[PDB]
Amino acid sequence: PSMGTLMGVYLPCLQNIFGVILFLRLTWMVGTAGVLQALLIVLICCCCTLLTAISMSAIATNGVVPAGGSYFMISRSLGPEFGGAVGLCFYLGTTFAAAMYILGAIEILLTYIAPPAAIFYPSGAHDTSNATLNNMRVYGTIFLTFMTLVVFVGVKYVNKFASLFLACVIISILSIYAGGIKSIFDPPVFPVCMLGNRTLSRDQFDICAKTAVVDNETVATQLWSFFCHSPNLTTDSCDPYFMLNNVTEIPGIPGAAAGVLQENLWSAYLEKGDIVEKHGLPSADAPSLKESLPLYVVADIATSFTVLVGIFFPSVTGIMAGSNRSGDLRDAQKSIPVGTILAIITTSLVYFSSVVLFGACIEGVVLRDKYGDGVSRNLVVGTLAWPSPWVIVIGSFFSTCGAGLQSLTGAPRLLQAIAKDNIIPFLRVFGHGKVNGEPTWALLLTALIAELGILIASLDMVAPILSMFFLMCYLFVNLACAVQTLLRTPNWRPRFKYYHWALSFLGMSLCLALMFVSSWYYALVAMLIAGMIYKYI
Amino acid sequence: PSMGTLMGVYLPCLQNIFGVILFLRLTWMVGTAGVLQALLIVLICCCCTLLTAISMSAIATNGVVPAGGSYFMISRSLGPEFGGAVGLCFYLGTTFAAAMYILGAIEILLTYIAPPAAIFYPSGAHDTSNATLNNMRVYGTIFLTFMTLVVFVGVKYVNKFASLFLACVIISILSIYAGGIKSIFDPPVFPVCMLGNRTLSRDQFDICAKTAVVDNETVATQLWSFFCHSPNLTTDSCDPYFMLNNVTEIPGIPGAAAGVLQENLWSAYLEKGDIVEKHGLPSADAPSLKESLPLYVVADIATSFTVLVGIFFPSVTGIMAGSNRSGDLRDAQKSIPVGTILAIITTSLVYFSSVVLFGACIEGVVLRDKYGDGVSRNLVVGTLAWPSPWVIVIGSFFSTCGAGLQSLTGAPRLLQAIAKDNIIPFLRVFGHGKVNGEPTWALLLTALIAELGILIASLDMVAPILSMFFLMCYLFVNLACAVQTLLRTPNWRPRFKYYHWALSFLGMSLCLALMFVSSWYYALVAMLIAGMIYKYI
Numbered sequence A, B: 001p002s003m004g005t006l007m008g009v010y011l012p013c014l015q016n017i018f019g020v021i022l023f024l025r026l027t028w029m030v031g032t033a034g035v036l037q038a039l040l041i042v043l044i045c046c047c048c049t050l051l052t053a054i055s056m057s058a059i060a061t062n063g064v065v066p067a068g069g070s071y072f073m074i075s076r077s078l079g080p081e082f083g084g085a086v087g088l089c090f091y092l093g094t095t096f097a098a099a100m101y102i103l104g105a106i107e108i109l110l111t112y113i114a115p116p117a118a119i120f121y122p123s124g125a126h127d128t129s130n131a132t133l134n135n136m137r138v139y140g141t142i143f144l145t146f147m148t149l150v151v152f153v154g155v156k157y158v159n160k161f162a163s164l165f166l167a168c169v170i171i172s173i174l175s176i177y178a179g180g181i182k183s184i185f186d187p188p189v190f191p192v193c194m195l196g197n198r199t200l201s202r203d204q205f206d207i208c209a210k211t212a213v214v215d216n217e218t219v220a221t222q223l224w225s226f227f228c229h230s231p232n233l234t235t236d237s238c239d240p241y242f243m244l245n246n247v248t249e250i251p252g253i254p255g256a257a258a259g260v261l262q263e264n265l266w267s268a269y270l271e272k273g274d275i276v277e278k279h280g281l282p283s284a285d286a287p288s289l290k291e292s293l294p295l296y297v298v299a300d301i302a303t304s305f306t307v308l309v310g311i312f313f314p315s316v317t318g319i320m321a322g323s324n325r326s327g328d329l330r331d332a333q334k335s336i337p338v339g340t341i342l343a344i345i346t347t348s349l350v351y352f353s354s355v356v357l358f359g360a361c362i363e364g365v366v367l368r369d370k371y372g373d374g375v376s377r378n379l380v381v382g383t384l385a386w387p388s389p390w391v392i393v394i395g396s397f398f399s400t401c402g403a404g405l406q407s408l409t410g411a412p413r414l415l416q417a418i419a420k421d422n423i424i425p426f427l428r429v430f431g432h433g434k435v436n437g438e439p440t441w442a443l444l445l446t447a448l449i450a451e452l453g454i455l456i457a458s459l460d461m462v463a464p465i466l467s468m469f470f471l472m473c474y475l476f477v478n479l480a481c482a483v484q485t486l487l488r489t490p491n492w493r494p495r496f497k498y499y500h501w502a503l504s505f506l507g508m509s510l511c512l513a514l515m516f517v518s519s520w521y522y523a524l525v526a527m528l529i530a531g532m533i534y535k536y537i
């Protein structure tokens, strides 16, 4: 074994922690929650994982660190019963993370790369969502079957391109920060068209004006005809909000300044159907027609604190991938606790600094446009990039497609190990393999379980389920590190300096409170199942 | 044993088949789907149960009919493996039926008996639903804990009042038909106020007119001030749909005639947010303000065929309660197949004739008002009653509160039997009992599983889950009656005249297609779990 801390522990953690939510949902989270509550979300979600890494360090500093995987360390150092629970929750988390990574790639493809590559179209006036869901499901079943065939044939090729997907993430992050520094002295041009407080969808009309001049004549624009249903300048069919108010352009990226950061500082939660609005604009109050409602940027889902925590939390998962090469290391009891804790610290500093950067550079109206309707269907992250917005689009697409392949390779190997371990006999039949040792019936079960996550067809609906499984895995790791100290069981002497049982107890309680914060109902279901297995024993 | 067919098999089936959906959701289903598609829903949902009763007759005509319950017949006549599946699916169905019966009683209490007995109020303008859900959950946890204490103490008293809850159902059905016959020559007076096609909520304003006369002076009414935001007769702040249209009263119950039945004959499916409208009225087309949207009757959920099937199907469940007294009967191989099939035929004739009666007597605008907003917060069923609408309100409340108690008494006894039967050792610890033999740890598990159904807090969200469990139970009964004939296993010789294996095969395929019709996603989950247990064996 010859593999150091950097390329053995640190870089796989840093590759498995960054992902889809930094490029699709972080600006939305900043603009919805405010800078202060977004920093609070990042702080709370990075203390479950830091305390869980302190417990995993106490795992790795005990004994020999047996070769192969993070399942075998836990199972040989904690007894089989905690090992089975940690392994099964981590397996279900990895299989739904594959589905979330596929849904992210299809959102990027259908909204930014090729919008004409769309099968189902929003017929009628309203319900653009059912066309969107049925459009996500078809491409989800296509990409999932293609990638399971790739994993069924070409594992050697998936292991080959693993550095390129990390290079794409790092180049696309450095482009964000390079453009954010340039926005201090030279911000880019993305004008946002508004009407009173209300922001509107710029993709539908031509010019952001109420009237124009053609051939020495004042003629109503296309924007007049959507609100007034007549090309005449003196009709009374207009809605009274359009008549009393005026149409105004603003800079979408006003540049890095303290005045922009002061406006983005507090929460602006909306319900489903509300309109994204500024705060410092004059707006005469008036009723508005129901028919002019598609001419605005509308909140897609109802938001709160507990909604945003469950969507953010799978950004911080990825600790457990620092022990998959635990046999290949030179000093596994030293390279694991340093590598995972430094990876959590660096990725958490990237999230804090990016929350402050997006809160200081981008205006909160553009931030709250999930899918970027206020600026001509562009990434809100991509408009801040330095060379072009296409670098972030292409790089985030290839990185999410790589992160899906890595989950579809990592989860059947894990189910293979629990099957051959024979703690649960009900999972006996998934120990079959080929002559290479590659799993067959486990790959089918991961493809069918990740299919049930793809048929939910939303990035915002699958991510609380991921939070729910990774929080159970991290809860049982902290239970099994606190109980073995309080019971004084033999062969449990962790040689880690910064370990204490109260830290693992605090980590257990925090990763249990986040389980209720993310979704209280399914946490209350899992509490019943856990309280029933305890009565079984 | 001295107990005949009528009081032993027929009356418990007829008591357990009628219930909450005949009084709360049948008029809504007729008005939404049309008379023809409502008869098609009743026909399809009564052919799964008739074929399942033909299979249960082949169970009862084999062998001895061992004493006690419907679980012991199936388990001794089909092998333990099918018996465990049928028993566990029927247990989960009974525990969620308790939750649906509690949610029905709380809907009746909070909307018709005591609307001031409401904790959470709809603050703001919109979202009257979250106040409603949080208002259902609190009273659900109160009624569930009270009834589990009653079952924990007073089983002898719950068995005593069992005839009174059947008397309430039969009196409240006879009042419906007595009022429906009276509506031929003397219909009751329930005027419905409308504005163009759109129907409005009469509970908010006083008089159904656009202007009135007070003290020899034409003054705008209260209904003017909601749409125009000014008491002056000559303002231009009115929405243009209110100006171009006129306000009209219609009879809500126009009486039994062929012309009313001809209008109610075809489907009118709406999406969530649409307005209930007539078809034969003049209405000038115009836009409408967003602020006047609470002044209408709005569709609560999006409806289709597959939505209404899953809501209707737990009306027809209740076959399996014809064998709970299988030891007390004089001739159990004769009293069961006659009693259950005659009970299914009589209850299905009641549903067909009531669908035709509500389609012929009540106007389809009043039928599509779930919660009865178009007529002064009254039951749509209750307005057709002969003495008073209060008889149906009180009788349906007491019958649903009795049907919840009967499920909370029947499900822990069933889990007790599967625990003592020892096919699944994981359920070993639920075989404990008191000195009376009454279950203790099973009653706790039924109270915690029915709590997870109450925390969904909708009658329309729990009923597809009930359909999902009773259809799996009825599928395994037909599998176990077809496979034992095709495999020619010993000790399976059913002495029933009208049994054939193709009928049970057709019943299996129909109760599998209804599983996809009711909700395709959770059926696709259960298909995975069933295909995994088969690979285990």
Ligand SMILES: C[C@@H]1CC[C@@]2(OC1)O[C@H]1C[C@H]3[C@@H]4CC=C5C[C@@H](OCCC(CO[C@@H]6O[C@H](CO)[C@@H](O[C@H]7O[C@H](CO)[C@@H](O)[C@H](O)[C@H]7O)[C@H](O)[C@H]6O)CO[C@@H]6O[C@H](CO)[C@@H](O[C@H]7O[C@H](CO)[C@@H](O)[C@H](O)[C@H]7O)[C@H](O)[C@H]6O)CC[C@]5(C)[C@H]4CC[C@]3(C)[C@H]1[C@@H]2C
Pocket: A088, A092, A272, A301, A302, A307, A427, A445, A449, A452, A453, A455, A456, A457, A458, A460, A461, A464, A465, A519, B519, B520, B521, B525, B528, B529, B532
């Ligand atoms: C050890 C061995 C390994 C394999 C195995 O065991 C043995 O492992 C286990 C693990 C199992 C899996 C465990 C967990 C599971 C998750 C479970 O999902 C629960 C709820 C979610 C799914 O929602 C469903 O999604 C479908 C599809 O949309 C819906 O079906 C609909 O489909 C069509 C649409 O065209 C239509 O007919 C209807 O819409 C409907 O039929 C279901 O109805 C729906 O329940 C998460 O969804 C939740 O939905 C909420 C919406 O109300 C949402 O709330 C918010 O919604 C929006 C946000 O988008 C906002 O407006 C508001 O803020 C809220 O209203 C929630 O966010 C969201 O959580 C499914 C099963 C599965 C995968 C288990 C499968 C078996 C399993 C793998 C076993 C194996 C054997």
Ligand SMILES: C[C@@H]1CC[C@@]2(OC1)O[C@H]1C[C@H]3[C@@H]4CC=C5C[C@@H](OCCC(CO[C@@H]6O[C@H](CO)[C@@H](O[C@H]7O[C@H](CO)[C@@H](O)[C@H](O)[C@H]7O)[C@H](O)[C@H]6O)CO[C@@H]6O[C@H](CO)[C@@H](O[C@H]7O[C@H](CO)[C@@H](O)[C@H](O)[C@H]7O)[C@H](O)[C@H]6O)CC[C@]5(C)[C@H]4CC[C@]3(C)[C@H]1[C@@H]2C
Pocket: A519, A520, A521, A525, A528, A529, A532, B088, B092, B272, B301, B302, B307, B427, B445, B449, B452, B453, B455, B456, B457, B458, B460, B461, B464, B465, B519
């Ligand atoms: C043998 C031994 C015995 C005991 C045991 O095993 C051992 O038995 C098993 C059996 C287990 C149970 C099996 C099945 C279960 C059902 C499962 O529910 C699945 C989905 C449904 C629940 O929905 C959830 O409801 C909660 C509460 O609302 C939501 O949480 C929300 O709460 C708040 C609201 O304030 C807010 O934060 C968010 O809204 C959210 O957090 C969940 O999100 C939600 O998933 C059914 O709900 C489905 O919801 C759809 C809405 O999207 C709806 O679609 C339609 O919705 C409306 C209609 O109303 C229409 O507009 C459209 O037509 C559609 O959108 C669907 O109709 C609806 O199906 C929960 C677990 C449970 C009970 C298992 C528990 C364990 C169990 C008993 C074991 C034991 C151990």
Ligand SMILES: *[C@@H]1O[C@H](CO)[C@@H](O[C@@H]2O[C@H](CO)[C@@H](O)[C@H](O)[C@H]2NC(C)=O)[C@H](O)[C@H]1NC(C)=O
Pocket: A244, A245, A246, A282, A283, A284
């Ligand atoms: C919308 O913007 C226009 C600017 O074109 C505002 O116009 C007012 O115009 C009159 C006469 O042209 C001036 O005397 C006022 O000083 C203007 N008001 C200003 C500059 O605030 C108009 O008031 C705006 N509408 C609003 C703010 O509701």
Ligand SMILES: *[C@@H]1O[C@H](CO)[C@@H](O[C@@H]2O[C@H](CO)[C@@H](O)[C@H](O)[C@H]2NC(C)=O)[C@H](O)[C@H]1NC(C)=O
Pocket: A196, A197, A198, A277, A278, A279, A280, A283, A284, A285, A286
């Ligand atoms: C944007 O402008 C509106 C008025 O044009 C602001 O005022 C609110 O308007 C709604 C009407 O839907 C009223 O119900 C509220 O009471 C109004 N709030 C007031 C008067 O304080 C609205 O607040 C503005 N949005 C912002 C500042 O984010």
Ligand SMILES: *[C@@H]1O[C@H](CO)[C@@H](O[C@@H]2O[C@H](CO)[C@@H](O)[C@H](O)[C@H]2NC(C)=O)[C@H](O)[C@H]1NC(C)=O
Pocket: B244, B245, B246, B282, B283, B284
């Ligand atoms: C609403 O109802 C009124 C009835 O009061 C209709 O009034 C019309 O009134 C003029 C003059 O009073 C008559 O000459 C017309 O014959 C009436 N039209 C009829 C009876 O159809 C009014 O047209 C109605 N509005 C509609 C149908 O949009």
Ligand SMILES: *[C@@H]1O[C@H](CO)[C@@H](O[C@@H]2O[C@H](CO)[C@@H](O)[C@H](O)[C@H]2NC(C)=O)[C@H](O)[C@H]1NC(C)=O
Pocket: B196, B197, B198, B277, B278, B279, B280, B283, B284, B285, B286
């Ligand atoms: C009730 O009246 C409206 C017009 O007052 C009817 O017409 C439809 O109106 C909508 C506007 O929301 C249009 O999009 C449709 O194209 C109209 N349909 C037509 C003209 O056929 C509406 O159909 C009526 N409702 C009924 C008869 O149930």
Ligand SMILES: [Cl-]
Pocket: A017, A018, A019, A020, A021, A022, A314, A315
């Ligand atoms: Cl991620």
Ligand SMILES: [Cl-]
Pocket: A317, A318, A319, A320, A321
């Ligand atoms: Cl992880």
Ligand SMILES: [Cl-]
Pocket: B017, B018, B019, B020, B021, B022, B314, B315
């Ligand atoms: Cl019922």
Ligand SMILES: [Cl-]
Pocket: B317, B318, B319, B320, B321
């Ligand atoms: Cl039944």
Ligand SMILES: [K+]
Pocket: A016, A017, A018, A019, A314, A315, A316, A317, A318
């Ligand atoms: K991650």
Ligand SMILES: [K+]
Pocket: B016, B017, B018, B019, B314, B315, B316, B317, B318
């Ligand atoms: K029933």
